[PDB]
Amino acid sequence: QQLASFLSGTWQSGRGRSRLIHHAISGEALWEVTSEGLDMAAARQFAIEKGAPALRAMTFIERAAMLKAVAKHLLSEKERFYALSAQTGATRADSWVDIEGGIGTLFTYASLGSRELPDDTLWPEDELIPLSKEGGFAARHLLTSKSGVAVHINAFNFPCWGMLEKLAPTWLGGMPAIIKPATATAQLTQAMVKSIVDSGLVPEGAISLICGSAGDLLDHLDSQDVVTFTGSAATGQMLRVQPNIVAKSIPFTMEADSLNCCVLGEDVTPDQPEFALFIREVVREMTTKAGQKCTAIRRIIVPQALVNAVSDALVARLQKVVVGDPAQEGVKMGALVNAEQRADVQEKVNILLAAGCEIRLGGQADLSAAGAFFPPTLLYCPQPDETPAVHATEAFGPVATLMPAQNQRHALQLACAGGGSLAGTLVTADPQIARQFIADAARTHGRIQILNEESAKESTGHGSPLPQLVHGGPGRAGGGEELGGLRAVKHYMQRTAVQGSPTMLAAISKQWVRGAKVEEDRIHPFRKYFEELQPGDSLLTPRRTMTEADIVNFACLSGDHFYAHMDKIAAAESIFGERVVHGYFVLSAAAGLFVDAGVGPVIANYGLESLRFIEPVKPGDTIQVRLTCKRKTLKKQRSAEEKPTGVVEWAVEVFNQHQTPVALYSILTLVARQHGDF
Amino acid sequence: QQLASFLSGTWQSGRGRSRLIHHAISGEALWEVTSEGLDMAAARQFAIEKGAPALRAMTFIERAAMLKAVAKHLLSEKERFYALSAQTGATRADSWVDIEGGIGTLFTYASLGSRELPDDTLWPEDELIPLSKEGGFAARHLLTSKSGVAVHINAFNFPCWGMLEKLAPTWLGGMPAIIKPATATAQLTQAMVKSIVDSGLVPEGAISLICGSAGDLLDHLDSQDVVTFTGSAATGQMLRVQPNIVAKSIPFTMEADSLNCCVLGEDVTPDQPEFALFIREVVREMTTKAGQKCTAIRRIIVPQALVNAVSDALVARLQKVVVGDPAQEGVKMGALVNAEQRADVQEKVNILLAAGCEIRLGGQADLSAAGAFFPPTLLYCPQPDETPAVHATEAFGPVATLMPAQNQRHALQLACAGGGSLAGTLVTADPQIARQFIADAARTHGRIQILNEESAKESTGHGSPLPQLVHGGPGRAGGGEELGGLRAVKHYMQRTAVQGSPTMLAAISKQWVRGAKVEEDRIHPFRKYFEELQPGDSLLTPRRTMTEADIVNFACLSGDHFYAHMDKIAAAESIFGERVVHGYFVLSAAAGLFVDAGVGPVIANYGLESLRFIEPVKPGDTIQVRLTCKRKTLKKQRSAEEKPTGVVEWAVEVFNQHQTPVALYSILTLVARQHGDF
Ligand SMILES: C/C=C/C(=O)SCCNC(=O)CCNC(=O)[C@@H](O)C(C)(C)COP(=O)(O)OP(=O)(O)OC[C@H]1O[C@@H](n2cnc3c(N)ncnc32)[C@H](O)[C@@H]1OP(=O)(O)O
Ligand SMILES: C/C=C/C(=O)SCCNC(=O)CCNC(=O)[C@@H](O)C(C)(C)COP(=O)(O)OP(=O)(O)OC[C@H]1O[C@@H](n2cnc3c(N)ncnc32)[C@H](O)[C@@H]1OP(=O)(O)O
Ligand SMILES: NC(=O)c1ccc[n+]([C@@H]2O[C@H](COP(=O)([O-])OP(=O)(O)OC[C@H]3O[C@@H](n4cnc5c(N)ncnc54)[C@H](OP(=O)(O)O)[C@@H]3O)[C@@H](O)[C@H]2O)c1
Ligand SMILES: NC(=O)c1ccc[n+]([C@@H]2O[C@H](COP(=O)([O-])OP(=O)(O)OC[C@H]3O[C@@H](n4cnc5c(N)ncnc54)[C@H](OP(=O)(O)O)[C@@H]3O)[C@@H](O)[C@H]2O)c1
């Protein structure tokens, strides 16, 4: 039975040599895959001339609303995904992660990119860099989307998560994606892609899928393309030196295997509650998803006097795990995915047993069953710093080794001897052991969890990549970063420094900056709706003289009898030389000068973004305020009962009779719209 | 005569086959370089075990003061540097840019790190990420420093600027450096390194130099190292695939050659001031440094109806240029650096002449004189969209080519046809033309200048990299980035998401976060000096009941007669339901509860960082304020007369009688120190 590929808008299939997909709990072939004789250059050409100009013609807010709509469409028909995921040998709780945590990444990116990204095709990330003495020459940074494709090469662990966490920043950035999943579990990836395509939510050409080898795709890419890899450390170092990639200098993000430590602290005795949650965390992280997640604990570093207390407490917790079929009852651990995986785990277990020891059911594995089972395995290594095969070999199954250390200076070296890891855990209760651990072992790790009694109630775990924390690590773990929040949408964009006059930078960025021309238009700017405000609508307020009575009235009403405002002997010895006006009174009298009183489109204020007081204000000194619209960035009206609205930022500039700018700042405002959208 | 290399603390010299450094304006050989038989593993050993812990034990503020002291020490003895730089064939106005821009890079990276970096060894870049529903589990991102070396490989253009723009983020990030300069002009780099080392300002092992070939250094590196390359594309694509770099996955940042454009807008006619500054900018950028900078204009795109006038004015402007010895008077353009450069520019000029045309003195360059000169060359290409050898071949001299376009849609394609560039220029006066140019041609450029009459009076130039703007480009320009501000010190660091309880993240980051434990002291925190404030010192103030008269008094004193505070009919038809207390009165009455009225260590306030109003405050509602210290970050007392001080940040949290957090924010304060440092 053929597995199709979505190329050039059409479902196609290959002709020729083929591989095939076995069932995991029984072991018969129920799909067979090939991609031979298909045109890859035409697929890239259709992607570039069709899906890239459609995505690059949207704002970021529309591109986040598209992600929320696709997420709501894929959440409803979720039960046709659990049926395909049970064929991979996973349980129900171990497939809940793969389905729901991969769909929740879309909701996370839709909520992030609607509150923090502009309503434009470009995205100015900085404020302003003044590069002159008068103010006629400045610069600022911009981020524009590339005009190519993003080629993703996934693994076999998470077909629903690992495809779809690389795809929310790709669509949110403005590029069309081509997915090449692993050919051992591609039948879930095809169902995901088919549910995306057959809904009419994304534009055409914005997603493509190849099932089988890519063949002749990396030899056709241009310098506006990006490539992301996820797999072992032996394939990605062959794909890094591919001559088109090093010729055209295209971004290649490699991310590979790792050895993830879990260090027990010196301040832990077996009567404390730390020991039980340590054992629980190690057992859960070693038995979840049959040990087939990349963020699993594989090196357990314990102190010397607590080895026999740990190695006896793990095994009694581990013998209660019943390995078998996930559909029948009483079974917690499922199976592996292939017989090749059952061979490849045990051929690494034998390499570890060439210099290690044995605590449980290790190299015993039934290599002739109709089902990819492997028993949970705990090893031991009494010479940790004289056996380099422990610190370089990961058995990608339920296997983890145990080794001792000596008082927080040998453990800090055994944790850094992994050569670049992907995750780490420390179990302590002393907050000055965690500081010494972070100051020396955060170089090799990309995510570190400190675990104690308070954190363990609502912790997500050692091996759960959150979609707003950096997922990556140096050295052996590839050297790339994913999922850093909005750090991941910047891997699909070009950063540019634009220079010129401020009145030109304001027209490029569609935001008034500081020195641009203004537009005074004879009616008050708080009387306009959202659709008739443009960035650069300015108001010059009338003046107000700050007298000596104003200082006394504000200090009486507020309560701030500070010595630079109320005393006279001590005011003549400070930095100001005499007693001055309060800063919050300047802040309040400014708002008294520009705020309109009548009922209009302005609803709420709720914000003050960045205030700096520059020069002091004295009695006998006037105040005049300039109010300028700056940024518009509407909201999406998630229901039909609600009111259409948007959020306008106004820049406020105060100055005295000498026109020098005391106290310049910026406020937020929620302005109602005339025409709704949904 | 030897050229010594400073390795392992000793000035050494090689024994073997050698290359030699000539004189650029006369022709005699006056140095000779070699590095054979030097121990390259021992230099990395000395830098890791001797110089790196001396840098990773300083704070960021001390590492910025070190840069400022080294800059002030190297600015004084600059007159030997001009004498060394005149041997390279450059004028005084071209050596000024090199030497003084190199030292101004250090002044800029000291003045940024003095203001925007903490007083710590670790650097938290986020604020807080709440990952829970109760509040006992959060995460934040840390940046720690790597524990290896930084191998910098430079080019022959800027021996003083190019070394010292890679070295300031390296030293500010806390890593040592090994500089390999280009052996064609390595006599000035050694004088720089000697003037740095013979001052006692930097630690030992913190800087190393190799004059000659690196030989075997790149086979000895580790995953905690970084490599930066600056040169041609054909060399950096051979050093990218070096089998230790791809096996250990170490960061390699290549930055290569580019074909920089300068597009003339359609709305510019020769009776405008734009035309003369266009001609001036092209001629100055082509005749500066004899066209030996990477950010020089090499393709000139003009409209079709203006080819002849531009081709006349450029030749009438360029024939006034005198090429000769720089020391004798009346000479504008200097010389090249080697006879090999004179022989290698013209073999590119002949490749361009295999399909182009000729406007001035090109391939008639005297290849037998004493001193490497080359005449200012202007070319022409009547068929730009059919000759690919214009858009791929660069001549690294005074050579630039000219070509027409057709009404702002062929020019936007000829500007992007370069294959990724390093800089670009548009000369217009219409801001919509600039919007269209940035929206289509910023994908391939890494810095774009828009030039008009306002900008031209104080523009730094087309080809001057500012130290606080991104210097890099996609595609053919390498793909790397440098000089991005504080974006470049993050290339020498590791980012880590640390998870845990807020009382543990507060101990790791040495800053109170949101939910950590507090330390109440029974004396007021505005009475302590800077050396006895700890992050976590908290004050819980008495209460104040917001009555109805307070709304009227604050609205009368400020002048804000807004309808949600003063009108009663329209307040019942708004979102709040009834009329509420002002936001600025909550801000001003919170400050009356925690401010000490007497004279003490607190000097000024001057700041307010992030204010958000959460719930509305009504009449009959009590208010209580919590005030917690957050971050200390002292200042370095630039004189011996000034009072010592630091800048303490407090976090303010207001809540009502239901303890829900109305209006939480954060303020800045300048607090005096007890004991000064200088
Ligand atoms: C191939 C390479 C080519 C080139 O680089 S050519 C570069 C051409 N650019 C220029 O000429 C500069 C352009 N100007 C701008 O952009 C201008 O916005 C500008 C950079 C002045 C802006 O003014 P700044 O005050 O920001 O200048 P700096 O950051 O460089 O220096 C400030 C700092 O340096 C100290 N300092 C002392 N003496 C000096 C000296 N002598 N020089 C520099 N800095 C000094 C001084 O104490 C000052 O203390 P603080 O302000 O309190 O931090
Ligand atoms: C290998 C893979 C491993 C894993 O992924 S394991 C991941 C484990 N993580 C978890 O289980 C979640 C942990 N929680 C956190 O981290 C928590 O910080 C958190 C993720 C709630 C933080 O809260 P968020 O607001 O960021 O969560 P969401 O943005 O996804 O949900 C809110 C948002 O989503 C929308 N929405 C609607 N339906 C849903 C549904 N059904 N789901 C999500 N979001 C939805 C809803 O309209 C809301 O609209 P707005 O607030 O106005 O923006
Ligand atoms: N985030 C992470 O760090 C992370 C996440 C998940 C998994 N991993 C690591 O990945 C490993 C398990 O996954 P894996 O076995 O699938 O790794 P793999 O064998 O190296 O293959 C990874 C992907 O590369 C493709 N591929 C293999 N050879 C290729 C070639 N010559 N040319 C082009 N593409 C090729 C594969 O497709 P085919 O199957 O068709 O060959 C597969 O999709 C584990 O070591 C695990 O630690 C790491
Ligand atoms: N920021 C930028 O984009 C930028 C800046 C400046 C210059 N450039 C470009 O650089 C070019 C001019 O510089 P260049 O001619 O000096 O470049 P290059 O000759 O090709 O080489 C650059 C550096 O690489 C070293 N190198 C060469 N072969 C090597 C090998 N086999 N192993 C190790 N190192 C080796 C050279 O040292 P040796 O000289 O001792 O052999 C030199 O220091 C121009 O094309 C210019 O556009 C770009």
CA angle at A292 for the pair A290 and A293, rounded to the nearest 5°: 120
Quickly list H helices, B367-512: 411-414, 431-441, 502-509
Contact A423, A258 (CB under 8 A): yes
Q: Is B315 on the interface with A (CB under 8 A)?
A: no
Tell me, what amino acid is at A366?
A: D
CA angle at B387 for the pair B382 and B391, rounded to the nearest 5°: 105
Q: Ligand 3 pocket: which of A164, A232, A253 to mutate (most atoms <8 Å of CB)?
A: A232
Residues 6 or more apart whose CB falls under 8 angstroms from that of A233 comprise: A256, A257, A476, A478
* Class of the CATH domain delimited by A495-672: alpha beta
CATH number for domain B5-257+487-493, candidates 3.40.605.10, 1.20.120.530, 3.50.30.30, 2.60.15.10: 3.40.605.10
For chains A and B, CB pairs below 8 A equal 326
Alpha-carbon distances of A533 from A116, A346, A591, A650, B123, rounded to whole Å = 21, 68, 20, 11, 41
Tell me, what amino acid is at B252?
A: F
The protein residue whose alpha carbon is closest to atom 45 in ligand 2 is A107
Q: Strands (DSSP E) along B428-560, which ranges?
A: 447-451, 468-472, 481-484, 493-500, 538-540, 544-546
**DSSP three-state, residue A615:** coil
Q: For residues B221 and B178, what is the distance between their CA atoms, to the nearest angstrom?
A: 12
Transcribe A302-350 into DSSP letters.
Answer: EEGGGHHHHHHHHHHHHTT--BS-SSSTT--B---S-HHHHHHHHHHHH
Task: Identify which of A275, A240, A604, A611 has the alpha carbon closest to the alpha carbon of residue A429.
Answer: A275
Task: Identify which of B202, B164, B192 has the alpha carbon closest to the alpha carbon of residue B55.
Answer: B202
Calculate how far, in angstroms, residue A598's C-alpha sits from the geometric centre of ligand 4. 68
Q: What are phi and psi of B12, to 5 degrees?
A: -115, 175
Number of Cβ atoms within 10 Å of the Cβ of A67: 25
Q: What are phi and psi of A525, to 5 degrees?
A: -70, -10
Q: B51-86 as b/e, with b when 16 or more CB fall inside 10 Å? A: bbeebbebbbbebbbbbbebbeebeeebeebeebbb
Task: Identify which of B414, B435, B411, B422 has the alpha carbon closest to the alpha carbon of residue B462.
Answer: B422
Measure in Å the smallest separation between the Cα of B599 and chain A Cα atoms. 6
Transcribe B318-358 into DSSP letters.
Answer: HTT--BS-SSSTT--B---S-HHHHHHHHHHHHHHHTTS--
Quote the longest CA-to-CA distance of chain B: 95
Q: Is A588 on the interface with B (CB under 8 A)?
A: yes
Transcribe B638-665 into DSSP letters.
Answer: SSSSSPPEEEEEEEEEEE-TT----SBE
Alpha-carbon distances of A366 from A330, A339, A342, A343, rounded to whole Å = 21, 11, 9, 10
**How remote is the C-alpha of B153 from its chain's centroid?**
19
A418 interaction partners in chain B (CB closer than 8 Å)? none
Contact A250, A221 (CB under 8 A): yes
H or E segment and range at residue A403: strand A399-405
Report resolution (Å) to 1 decimal: 3.1
**DSSP three-state, residue A665:** strand
In chain B, where are the structural domains located? Answer: 5-257+487-493, 260-482, 495-672
Q: Nearest bound ligand to CA A227?
A: 3
Alpha-carbon distances of B236 from A486, B159, B539, rounded to whole Å = 31, 19, 59
Q: For residues A421 and A477, what is the distance between their CA atoms, to the nearest angstrom?
A: 6
Task: Identify which of A167, A125, A168, A147 has the alpha carbon closest to the alpha carbon of residue A493.
Answer: A147
Q: How many residues make up chain A in this entry?
A: 678
**Exposure of A79 by Cβ count < 10 A (0-12 exposed, 13-18 middle, 19+ buried)?**
exposed
DSSP state of A634: B
Quote the longest CA-to-CA distance of chain A: 96
- Tokens describing residue A311: 């190695």
- Tokens describing residue A209: 């899928």
H or E segment and range at residue A261: strand A260-264
Chain A: residue whose CA lies nearest to B461? A499
For this PDB entry, the determination method is cryo-EM
Alpha-carbon distances of A653 from A152, A621, B506, rounded to whole Å = 48, 16, 36
* Class of the CATH domain delimited by A5-256+487-493: alpha beta
**How remote is the C-alpha of B270 from its chain's centroid?**
37
Residues 6 or more apart whose CB falls under 8 angstroms from that of B522 comprise: none
Tell me, what amino acid is at B584?
A: Y
Where does residue B633 fall: left (phi above 0), alpha (psi -120 to 50 degrees), or beta otherwise? left
Q: For residues A320 and A314, what is the distance between their CA atoms, to the nearest angstrom?
A: 11
Ligand 3 binding pocket includes A193 (Cβ within 6 Å): no
Transcribe B374-402 into DSSP letters.
Answer: ----B---S-TTT-TTTTT---SSS-BEE
Residue matched to tokens 């595609």: B475
Q: Strands (DSSP E) along B136-281, which ranges?
A: 138-145, 150-153, 177-180, 207-209, 226-230, 252-255, 260-264
H or E segment and range at residue B64: helix B60-76
- Tokens describing residue B378: 């202007």
Task: Identify which of A296, A259, A260, A262 has the alpha carbon closest to the alpha carbon of residue A278.
Answer: A262
DSSP state of B476: G
Residues 6 or more apart whose CB falls under 8 angstroms from that of B83 comprise: none
Residues 6 or more apart whose CB falls under 8 angstroms from that of B369 comprise: none
Number of Cβ atoms within 10 Å of the Cβ of A575: 10
**DSSP three-state, residue A61:** helix
Contact B677, B644 (CB under 8 A): yes
Task: Identify which of A370, A165, A403, A416 has the alpha carbon closest to the alpha carbon of residue A298.
Answer: A403
Q: For residues A604 and A606, what is the distance between their CA atoms, to the nearest angstrom?
A: 6
The sign one gets for the Cα dihedral B111, B115, B119, B123 is: negative
The sign one gets for the Cα dihedral A206, A210, A213, A215 is: negative
**DSSP three-state, residue B3:** coil
Residues 6 or more apart whose CB falls under 8 angstroms from that of B315 comprise: B359, B360, B378
Q: B626-661 as b/e, with b when 16 or more CB fall inside 10 Å? A: bbbbbbbbbbeeeeeeeebbbbbbbbbbbbbeeeee
Pairing, β B424-427 against β B260-264: parallel
Q: For residues A51 and A203, what is the distance between their CA atoms, to the nearest angstrom?
A: 7
Contact B580, B616 (CB under 8 A): yes
Measure in Å the smallest separation between the Cα of B326 and chain A Cα atoms. 31
Q: For residues B188 and B185, what is the distance between their CA atoms, to the nearest angstrom?
A: 7
What is the Cβ-side half-sphere exposure of residue B260, based on CA atoms within 13 angstroms? 26
Q: What are phi and psi of B576, to 5 degrees?
A: -85, -25
Q: Strands (DSSP E) along B512-553, which ranges?
A: 538-540, 544-546
Q: For residues A183 and A21, what is the distance between their CA atoms, to the nearest angstrom?
A: 7
- Considering only CA atoms, give the Rg of chain B: 31
Q: What are phi and psi of B124, to 5 degrees?
A: -75, 120
Measure in Å the smallest separation between the Cα of A428 and chain B Cα atoms. 10
Position in ligand 2 atom list of the atom nearest CA A102: 5
Question: Distance from first CA to last CA of chain B, Å, rounded?
Answer: 44
Residue matched to tokens 């035309």: B275
Residue B249 and residue A595: Cβ atoms within 8 Å?
A: no
Contact B594, B579 (CB under 8 A): no
**How remote is the C-alpha of B150 from its chain's centroid?**
17
What is the Cβ-side half-sphere exposure of residue B70, based on CA atoms within 13 angstroms? 30
Number of Cβ atoms within 10 Å of the Cβ of B435: 16
Q: If contacts are CB pairs under 8 Å, which of residues 98-157 in chain B contact chain A?
A: 121-122, 129, 131-134, 136-137, 139, 141-142, 144-147
- Tokens describing residue A409: 């200076």
Ligand 4 binding pocket includes B232 (Cβ within 6 Å): yes
- Tokens describing residue A315: 């095994």
Alpha-carbon distances of B470 from A90, A141, A471, A496, B465, rounded to whole Å = 48, 8, 26, 7, 8
To the query of whether residue A294 is one of the catalytic residues in this protein, the response is yes
What CATH architecture does domain B260-482 belong to?
A: 3-Layer(aba) Sandwich (3.40)
